[PDB]
Amino acid sequence: MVWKVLIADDEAIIREGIRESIDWNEFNMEVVAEAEDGEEALELALRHRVDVLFVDLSMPIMDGLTLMKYAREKLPNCHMIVITGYDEFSYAQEAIRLQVDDYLLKPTDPQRLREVVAKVKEKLEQEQK
């Protein structure tokens, strides 16, 4: 039942902050995977067939955009949360083509993440009636 979440950020302090700022279980979610590059992250999303994925836009090896293009193709209704820095926000517009459920600013605060994660659960809940 519990929806599988992948967290992919090029910085461990931000990655392990998302992972531990919310009780994912209250949103019927479990984090099945974190990733530190976009090659490992795509591999991990396909292997765990994730429902929900947080991706930083900036990734080494394979960048966040290229990962998200592969992911929307191969996991046609995962929900996608693009994580952006301040210096990089003007370039999240290139992701609208991919239908991303939300955009997350980095570094985040626990209440913003809860609003984000509550939207996704709502849409997930609807597709499963």
Side-chain angles (χ1 to χ4, degrees), residues 16-38:
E16 301 290 359
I18 312 174
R19 197 177 204 312
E20 283 144 293
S21 289
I22 53 181
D23 192 357
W24 294 97
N25 187 236
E26 311 268 49
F27 300 102
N28 199 223
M29 298 185 203
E30 49 204 26
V31 173
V32 297
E34 317 169 41
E36 189 89 61
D37 64 295

Side-chain angles (χ1 to χ4, degrees), residues 9-124:
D9 201 86
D10 72 330
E11 289 176 353
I13 192 139
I14 289 299
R15 230 173 38 244
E16 301 290 359
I18 312 174
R19 197 177 204 312
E20 283 144 293
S21 289
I22 53 181
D23 192 357
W24 294 97
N25 187 236
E26 311 268 49
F27 300 102
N28 199 223
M29 298 185 203
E30 49 204 26
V31 173
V32 297
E34 317 169 41
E36 189 89 61
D37 64 295
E39 246 190 353
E40 193 210 0
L42 181 54
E43 174 241 25
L44 285 173
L46 304 186
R47 171 179 323 215
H48 288 260
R49 316 277 301 154
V50 298
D51 305 284
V52 176
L53 60 87
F54 291 71
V55 155
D56 180 50
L57 243 184
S58 279
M59 297 295 269
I61 302 328
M62 194 193 278
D63 81 303
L65 273 184
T66 294
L67 153 57
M68 278 187 280
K69 302 162 167 187
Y70 276 135
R72 170 91 303 140
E73 169 199 339
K74 304 190 147 282
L75 301 160
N77 207 4
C78 68
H79 304 247
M80 296 209 309
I81 302 96
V82 192
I83 309 163
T84 324
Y86 282 121
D87 62 290
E88 201 176 26
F89 208 115
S90 267
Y91 276 3
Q93 47 143 301
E94 297 144 0
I96 321 162
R97 297 148 203 170
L98 279 36
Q99 146 40 27
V100 312
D101 286 16
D102 211 296
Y103 301 79
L104 191 84
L105 200 280
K106 174 174 58 165
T108 182
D109 68 74
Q111 192 61 234
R112 176 56 196 136
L113 201 73
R114 153 163 260 135
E115 205 265 284
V116 173
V117 167
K119 293 162 111 269
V120 194
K121 187 224 183 209
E122 212 170 354
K123 309 174 177 279
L124 287 165

